[PDB]
Scaffold this active site. Sequence first.
Site, PDB file in Angstrom:
ATOM      1  N   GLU A  11      39.833  22.048   5.225  1.00 51.74           N
ATOM      2  CA  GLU A  11      40.685  22.649   6.164  1.00 51.74           C
ATOM      3  C   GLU A  11      41.406  21.329   6.718  1.00 51.74           C
ATOM      4  N   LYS A  87      21.882  17.473   8.396  1.00 49.15           N
ATOM      5  CA  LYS A  87      22.992  18.097   7.695  1.00 49.15           C
ATOM      6  C   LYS A  87      22.588  17.941   6.179  1.00 49.15           C
ATOM      7  N   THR A 205       3.413   2.545   5.705  1.00 54.07           N
ATOM      8  CA  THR A 205       4.460   3.083   4.852  1.00 54.07           C
ATOM      9  C   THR A 205       3.801   4.196   3.861  1.00 54.07           C
ATOM     10  N   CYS A 221      -3.776  -0.976   0.955  1.00 51.99           N
ATOM     11  CA  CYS A 221      -4.083  -2.262   0.267  1.00 51.99           C
ATOM     12  C   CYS A 221      -5.121  -1.703  -0.882  1.00 51.99           C
ATOM     13  N   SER A 229     -13.912 -11.621 -18.565  1.00 54.95           N
ATOM     14  CA  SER A 229     -14.162 -11.105 -19.962  1.00 54.95           C
ATOM     15  C   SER A 229     -12.942 -10.008 -20.278  1.00 54.95           C
ATOM     16  N   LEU A 230     -12.464  -9.728 -21.255  1.00 56.94           N
ATOM     17  CA  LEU A 230     -11.411  -8.945 -21.824  1.00 56.94           C
ATOM     18  C   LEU A 230     -11.764  -7.769 -21.139  1.00 56.94           C
ATOM     19  N   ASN A 433      -6.095  -9.606   0.250  1.00 57.02           N
ATOM     20  CA  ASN A 433      -4.955  -8.504  -0.159  1.00 57.02           C
ATOM     21  C   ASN A 433      -3.795  -9.090  -0.399  1.00 57.02           C
ATOM     22  N   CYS A 435      -0.929  -9.330   1.850  1.00 58.20           N
ATOM     23  CA  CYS A 435      -0.584  -9.708   3.097  1.00 58.20           C
ATOM     24  C   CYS A 435      -1.543 -10.665   3.971  1.00 58.20           C
ATOM     25  N   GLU A 437      -4.314 -10.013   5.183  1.00 57.86           N
ATOM     26  CA  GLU A 437      -5.146  -9.523   6.626  1.00 57.86           C
ATOM     27  C   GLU A 437      -6.346  -8.725   6.232  1.00 57.86           C
ATOM     28  N   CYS A 458      -7.899  -0.062   1.716  1.00 57.08           N
ATOM     29  CA  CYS A 458      -8.073  -0.120   3.259  1.00 57.08           C
ATOM     30  C   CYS A 458      -7.171   0.639   3.535  1.00 57.08           C
ATOM     31  N   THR A 620       7.877  -3.105   7.731  1.00 60.51           N
ATOM     32  CA  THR A 620       8.768  -1.729   7.968  1.00 60.51           C
ATOM     33  C   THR A 620       8.246  -0.655   8.761  1.00 60.51           C
ATOM     34  N   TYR A 726      -0.916 -16.690   5.962  1.00 62.96           N
ATOM     35  CA  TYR A 726       0.414 -15.673   5.175  1.00 62.96           C
ATOM     36  C   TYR A 726       1.502 -16.711   4.940  1.00 62.96           C
ATOM     37  N   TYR A 727       2.876 -16.250   5.320  1.00 63.85           N
ATOM     38  CA  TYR A 727       4.229 -16.933   5.141  1.00 63.85           C
ATOM     39  C   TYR A 727       4.097 -18.208   5.602  1.00 63.85           C
TER      40      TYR A 727
HETATM   41  N1  LIG Z   1      -7.160 -17.001 -25.482  1.00 67.38           N
HETATM   42  C1  LIG Z   1      -8.243 -16.261 -25.991  1.00 67.38           C
HETATM   43  N2  LIG Z   1      -9.035 -15.913 -25.053  1.00 67.38           N
HETATM   44  C2  LIG Z   1     -10.042 -14.995 -25.222  1.00 67.38           C
HETATM   45  C3  LIG Z   1     -10.194 -14.464 -26.478  1.00 67.38           C
HETATM   46  N3  LIG Z   1     -11.246 -13.561 -26.648  1.00 67.38           N
HETATM   47  C4  LIG Z   1     -11.647 -13.654 -25.222  1.00 67.38           C
HETATM   48  N4  LIG Z   1     -11.030 -14.478 -24.551  1.00 67.38           N
HETATM   49  C5  LIG Z   1     -11.316 -14.642 -23.016  1.00 67.38           C
HETATM   50  C6  LIG Z   1     -11.334 -13.513 -22.222  1.00 67.38           C
HETATM   51  C7  LIG Z   1     -12.383 -13.816 -21.034  1.00 67.38           C
HETATM   52  O1  LIG Z   1     -11.761 -14.715 -19.983  1.00 67.38           O
HETATM   53  C8  LIG Z   1     -13.205 -14.978 -21.740  1.00 67.38           C
HETATM   54  C9  LIG Z   1     -14.491 -14.302 -22.169  1.00 67.38           C
HETATM   55  O2  LIG Z   1     -14.121 -13.173 -23.049  1.00 67.38           O
HETATM   56  P1  LIG Z   1     -15.196 -12.018 -23.387  1.00 67.38           P
HETATM   57  O3  LIG Z   1     -16.208 -12.167 -22.252  1.00 67.38           O
HETATM   58  O4  LIG Z   1     -14.696 -10.715 -23.654  1.00 67.38           O
HETATM   59  O5  LIG Z   1     -16.073 -12.495 -25.075  1.00 67.38           O
HETATM   60  P2  LIG Z   1     -17.457 -12.415 -25.328  1.00 67.38           P
HETATM   61  O6  LIG Z   1     -18.464 -11.553 -24.382  1.00 67.38           O
HETATM   62  O7  LIG Z   1     -17.446 -11.770 -26.703  1.00 67.38           O
HETATM   63  O8  LIG Z   1     -17.653 -14.057 -25.492  1.00 67.38           O
HETATM   64  P3  LIG Z   1     -18.210 -14.997 -24.155  1.00 67.38           P
HETATM   65  O9  LIG Z   1     -19.764 -15.505 -24.690  1.00 67.38           O
HETATM   66  O10 LIG Z   1     -18.505 -14.334 -23.010  1.00 67.38           O
HETATM   67  O11 LIG Z   1     -17.424 -16.003 -24.352  1.00 67.38           O
HETATM   68  O12 LIG Z   1     -12.603 -15.260 -22.830  1.00 67.38           O
HETATM   69  C10 LIG Z   1      -9.306 -14.962 -27.637  1.00 67.38           C
HETATM   70  O13 LIG Z   1      -9.182 -14.629 -28.792  1.00 67.38           O
HETATM   71  N5  LIG Z   1      -8.220 -15.807 -27.242  1.00 67.38           N
HETATM   72  N1  LIG Z   2       6.259  -4.526  -0.534  1.00 67.57           N
HETATM   73  C1  LIG Z   2       5.092  -3.910  -0.630  1.00 67.57           C
HETATM   74  N2  LIG Z   2       4.831  -3.228  -1.629  1.00 67.57           N
HETATM   75  C2  LIG Z   2       3.473  -2.617  -1.769  1.00 67.57           C
HETATM   76  N3  LIG Z   2       2.668  -2.742  -0.880  1.00 67.57           N
HETATM   77  C3  LIG Z   2       2.931  -3.298   0.244  1.00 67.57           C
HETATM   78  C4  LIG Z   2       4.406  -3.912   0.490  1.00 67.57           C
HETATM   79  N4  LIG Z   2       4.231  -4.475   1.709  1.00 67.57           N
HETATM   80  C5  LIG Z   2       3.110  -4.493   2.368  1.00 67.57           C
HETATM   81  N5  LIG Z   2       2.370  -3.556   1.534  1.00 67.57           N
HETATM   82  C6  LIG Z   2       0.986  -2.993   1.795  1.00 67.57           C
HETATM   83  O1  LIG Z   2       0.866  -2.793   3.272  1.00 67.57           O
HETATM   84  C7  LIG Z   2      -0.107  -3.606   3.981  1.00 67.57           C
HETATM   85  C8  LIG Z   2       0.283  -4.082   5.243  1.00 67.57           C
HETATM   86  O2  LIG Z   2       1.690  -4.554   5.316  1.00 67.57           O
HETATM   87  P1  LIG Z   2       2.705  -3.740   6.219  1.00 67.57           P
HETATM   88  O3  LIG Z   2       4.019  -4.704   6.391  1.00 67.57           O
HETATM   89  O4  LIG Z   2       1.881  -3.591   7.689  1.00 67.57           O
HETATM   90  O5  LIG Z   2       3.130  -2.510   5.784  1.00 67.57           O
HETATM   91  P2  LIG Z   2       4.181  -1.437   6.118  1.00 67.57           P
HETATM   92  O6  LIG Z   2       5.653  -2.187   5.504  1.00 67.57           O
HETATM   93  O7  LIG Z   2       3.851  -0.137   5.725  1.00 67.57           O
HETATM   94  O8  LIG Z   2       4.183  -1.792   7.488  1.00 67.57           O
HETATM   95  C9  LIG Z   2      -0.219  -4.752   2.857  1.00 67.57           C
HETATM   96  O9  LIG Z   2      -1.588  -5.405   2.788  1.00 67.57           O
HETATM   97  C10 LIG Z   2      -0.122  -4.186   1.749  1.00 67.57           C
HETATM   98  O10 LIG Z   2      -1.342  -3.860   0.966  1.00 67.57           O
HETATM   99  N1  LIG Z   3      39.109  18.413   9.726  1.00 69.28           N
HETATM  100  C1  LIG Z   3      38.511  17.147   9.827  1.00 69.28           C
HETATM  101  N2  LIG Z   3      38.988  16.059   9.783  1.00 69.28           N
HETATM  102  C2  LIG Z   3      38.287  14.842   9.948  1.00 69.28           C
HETATM  103  N3  LIG Z   3      36.964  14.868  10.327  1.00 69.28           N
HETATM  104  C3  LIG Z   3      36.245  15.868  10.360  1.00 69.28           C
HETATM  105  C4  LIG Z   3      37.027  17.199  10.348  1.00 69.28           C
HETATM  106  N4  LIG Z   3      36.121  18.127  10.568  1.00 69.28           N
HETATM  107  C5  LIG Z   3      34.730  17.437  10.666  1.00 69.28           C
HETATM  108  N5  LIG Z   3      35.031  16.108  10.573  1.00 69.28           N
HETATM  109  C6  LIG Z   3      34.297  15.006  10.923  1.00 69.28           C
HETATM  110  C7  LIG Z   3      33.099  15.493  12.094  1.00 69.28           C
HETATM  111  C8  LIG Z   3      31.897  14.804  11.606  1.00 69.28           C
HETATM  112  O1  LIG Z   3      31.479  13.343  12.265  1.00 69.28           O
HETATM  113  C9  LIG Z   3      31.924  14.628  10.212  1.00 69.28           C
HETATM  114  C10 LIG Z   3      30.862  15.518   9.360  1.00 69.28           C
HETATM  115  O2  LIG Z   3      30.240  16.329  10.484  1.00 69.28           O
HETATM  116  P1  LIG Z   3      29.760  17.838   9.992  1.00 69.28           P
HETATM  117  O3  LIG Z   3      29.995  18.689  11.453  1.00 69.28           O
HETATM  118  O4  LIG Z   3      28.454  17.902   9.420  1.00 69.28           O
HETATM  119  O5  LIG Z   3      30.875  18.212   8.762  1.00 69.28           O
HETATM  120  P2  LIG Z   3      31.574  19.686   8.700  1.00 69.28           P
HETATM  121  O6  LIG Z   3      32.254  19.968  10.010  1.00 69.28           O
HETATM  122  O7  LIG Z   3      32.681  19.129   7.801  1.00 69.28           O
HETATM  123  O8  LIG Z   3      30.595  20.545   8.222  1.00 69.28           O
HETATM  124  O9  LIG Z   3      33.090  14.898   9.680  1.00 69.28           O
HETATM  125 MG   LIG Z   4     -18.347 -12.389 -22.187  1.00 69.21          MG
HETATM  126 MG   LIG Z   5      31.187  20.302  12.073  1.00 70.09          MG
END
Ligand SMILES: Nc1nc2c(ncn2[C@H]2C[C@H](O)[C@@H](COP(=O)(O)OP(=O)(O)OP(=O)(O)O)O2)c(=O)[nH]1
Ligand SMILES: Nc1ncnc2c1ncn2[C@@H]1O[C@H](COP(=O)(O)OP(=O)(O)O)[C@@H](O)[C@H]1O
Ligand SMILES: Nc1ncnc2c1ncn2[C@H]1C[C@H](O)[C@@H](COP(=O)(O)OP(=O)(O)O)O1
Ligand SMILES: [Mg+2]
Ligand SMILES: [Mg+2]
Lengths: 732, 35
Positions: A11, A87, A205, A221, A229-230, A433, A435, A437, A458, A620, A726-727
């Site tokens: 329009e 709308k 949230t 949370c 262990s792995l 956790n 944050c 808390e 939680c 939030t 915290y922060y």
């Molecule tokens: N960098 C590295 N870390 C490993 C390897 N294998 C296991 N790990 C790490 C993961 C764990 O934090 C820790 C213990 O590993 P596991 O408890 O799964 O091994 P496992 O029970 O066979 O032997 P353990 O007597 O507990 O050391 O070592 C590897 O090949 N390379």
């Molecule tokens: N950015 C984020 N992503 C995922 N989880 C979050 C985040 N921020 C907060 N949380 C969760 O919400 C809990 C409380 O934080 P809060 O700020 O109260 O959340 P909200 O934004 O819902 O108010 C935290 O312990 C965390 O587990």
């Molecule tokens: N002819 C026109 N020229 C300029 N703006 C307009 C218009 N008609 C509606 N608007 C404005 C008013 C509102 O703030 C915005 C959208 O609101 P709306 O009432 O949801 O839209 P519409 O009337 O187009 O369905 O656009």
């Molecule tokens: Mg082990």
């Molecule tokens: Mg309208």
Amino acid sequence: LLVTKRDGSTERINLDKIHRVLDWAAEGLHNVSISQVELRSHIQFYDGIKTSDIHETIIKAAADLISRDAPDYQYLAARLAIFHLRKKAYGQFEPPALYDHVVKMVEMGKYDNHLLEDYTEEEFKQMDTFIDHDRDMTFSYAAVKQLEGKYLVQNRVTGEIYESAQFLYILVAACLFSNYPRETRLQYVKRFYDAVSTFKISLPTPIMSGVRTPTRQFSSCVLIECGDSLDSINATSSAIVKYVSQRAGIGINAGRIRALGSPIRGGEAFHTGCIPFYKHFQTAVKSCSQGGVRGGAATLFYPMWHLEVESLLVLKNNRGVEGNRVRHMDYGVQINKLMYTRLLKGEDITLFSPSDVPGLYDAFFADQEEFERLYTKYEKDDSIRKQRVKAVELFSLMMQERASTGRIYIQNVDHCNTHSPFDPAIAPVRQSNLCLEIALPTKPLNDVNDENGEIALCTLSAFNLGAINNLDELEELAILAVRALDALLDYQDYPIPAAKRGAMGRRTLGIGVINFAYYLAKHGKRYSDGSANNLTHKTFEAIQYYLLKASNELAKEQGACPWFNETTYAKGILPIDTYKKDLDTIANEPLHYDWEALRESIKTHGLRNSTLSALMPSETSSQISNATNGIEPPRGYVSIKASKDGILRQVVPDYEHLHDAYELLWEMPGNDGYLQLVGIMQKFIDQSISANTNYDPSRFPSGKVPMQQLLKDLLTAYKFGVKTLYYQNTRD
Amino acid sequence: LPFQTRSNPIPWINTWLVSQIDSEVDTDDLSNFQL
Ligand SMILES: Nc1nc2c(ncn2[C@H]2C[C@H](O)[C@@H](COP(=O)(O)OP(=O)(O)OP(=O)(O)O)O2)c(=O)[nH]1
Ligand SMILES: Nc1ncnc2c1ncn2[C@@H]1O[C@H](COP(=O)(O)OP(=O)(O)O)[C@@H](O)[C@H]1O
Ligand SMILES: Nc1ncnc2c1ncn2[C@H]1C[C@H](O)[C@@H](COP(=O)(O)OP(=O)(O)O)O1
Ligand SMILES: [Mg+2]
Ligand SMILES: [Mg+2]
């Protein structure tokens, strides 16, 4: 020239249509200007311009006019945005019937089909009488953008918004009480809808975003403990991935992983260190962090006495190779009394790998006496790989990395078990956790589906301290809040079995507060001077008492939580017994409620929930009620907060009357006044508080923030029984 | 005044009408503290 209407038709351009809308949104508001919005829009007209783009431009314009001199633009921009969001979902301003909407939405797979199975058309039409869609006219602009951006059910590829604000509220009430008896179901549904739609209760949230949607995960949370262990590392990674894609924030406890250089299978392998596994936990989070309601994050915890601790503290700093940096996670350093003792005496701190020190790790949390025994014994043992560091230097490094990054957190593990609702012998807290808390017991996993492991969940909510006019209103609010969250535990799904086991055996809840700064402003008190000490004690006693009383009555109705015997409440111990005695030198406010009678009722009937209170930041969720987030003082009278669209301006509640009563964040001389309040709150809080430490470099000589103050404040935090830090905010 | 008190309906016209951390630590000062 021609505009393109919402329904596709065109329009003649008519600016009176714009005057009408803006005059409507500005009616009743003081010190707003129709002319300002139109001119600040700089709306560029072209032939065929969509009428929807026109409205989004005047929303942005009216939203950026929020200022101290003109606070009421927060409602002008909100009323315009609500009108736009109406709308977007319905094609009109008038929302449809609750039944007709749910039918269409369940049919589209956007709602959970159980809504039609649990409520009849006669019941749905009865809840449509509960709804007051004019409560959409009580939001601030920041609230509406969080609804549009995060909470309102929407398509994350189309951008298509599907529902109104009051439908979100009423269906969260319907679903959480859907499993209630018919005699009191709609009675509670109405009462809880009113409570949250009029901002008496704040919902987090995942609840706002998800409760009514097919995918059922609503716990904010998730606390995962990792073994050395792995199989546990694999299980931890899998659990992180699962829950990060489910609106959750992770807390990881990787303190058990043996240090770099430790032998594996008796020397068949050489342990390359913790950091290669921390990188695996990071990519686990980031793999599917974004794409949903918001970007998830995670905080990793390790004990201060770990051998690699000097390399784990610097993980977020830029100055180093990518091989030694895991930047995109936060970290919590675990400290107990003995570590602080070494700092105060200028002595050293011996670093061990947890694999070389039997029972030293479990004692670090559960048994503070046994830890000191094992620690000094292992310190003298020469057959144990150790490393000595000056406590003065180790603390300086940590507080320095906490300062520059801001996300290096601190958890006093001994306070989290001496003054906790859990028996450290039976179910110790070894972690926190995202944050900092939440403090709940955990046991590491052997498989993704290990039945014997425990992942702590939680579920959260908050009391709006500005919304209440008398502390006894909390009794009624605590009943509504606890009931809604407890029934949520049975209603939602659990992607990890060990997580369901913890949530169902403990039924832990975390209810906190928002609008605390406005609450002190209404009482003419301040953070720093110490005038809120006795008021804070009186306030949070009522919160914890009415929360325990609400869950204690709920334990009568449906039975205490299965693992209640593991709690200190089961043994008849209350927070008023185990609190840090130093609080008695900063607060002489007496107890006002019958705690000994509550002690008897808990001794007898138990608690439906192992924990109830925890003070979360509500970064939030508090914006919905335009409340000051959590207990933190607002950064300014008009605060700048973030969103997926862009920046948001948030006016402090009741600015026109209370702008003097507010003590802004950087108006505080130091943290001693604030930290005392956190300690006083912790006297009653089951879990912990996301307490911030703030520093203004300009308030210090030579413009540099002294390490002396960072440490003195960290000690005064522990002295008053603060569980976690915290922060750390640094100005500019 | 013949009219009601009112806020400025065109506020935009006023544009035209009027033209790193101190690292030092003292453990003795910290020792003056009981946890
Ligand atoms: N960098 C590295 N870390 C490993 C390897 N294998 C296991 N790990 C790490 C993961 C764990 O934090 C820790 C213990 O590993 P596991 O408890 O799964 O091994 P496992 O029970 O066979 O032997 P353990 O007597 O507990 O050391 O070592 C590897 O090949 N390379
Ligand atoms: N950015 C984020 N992503 C995922 N989880 C979050 C985040 N921020 C907060 N949380 C969760 O919400 C809990 C409380 O934080 P809060 O700020 O109260 O959340 P909200 O934004 O819902 O108010 C935290 O312990 C965390 O587990
Ligand atoms: N002819 C026109 N020229 C300029 N703006 C307009 C218009 N008609 C509606 N608007 C404005 C008013 C509102 O703030 C915005 C959208 O609101 P709306 O009432 O949801 O839209 P519409 O009337 O187009 O369905 O656009
Ligand atoms: Mg082990
Ligand atoms: Mg309208």
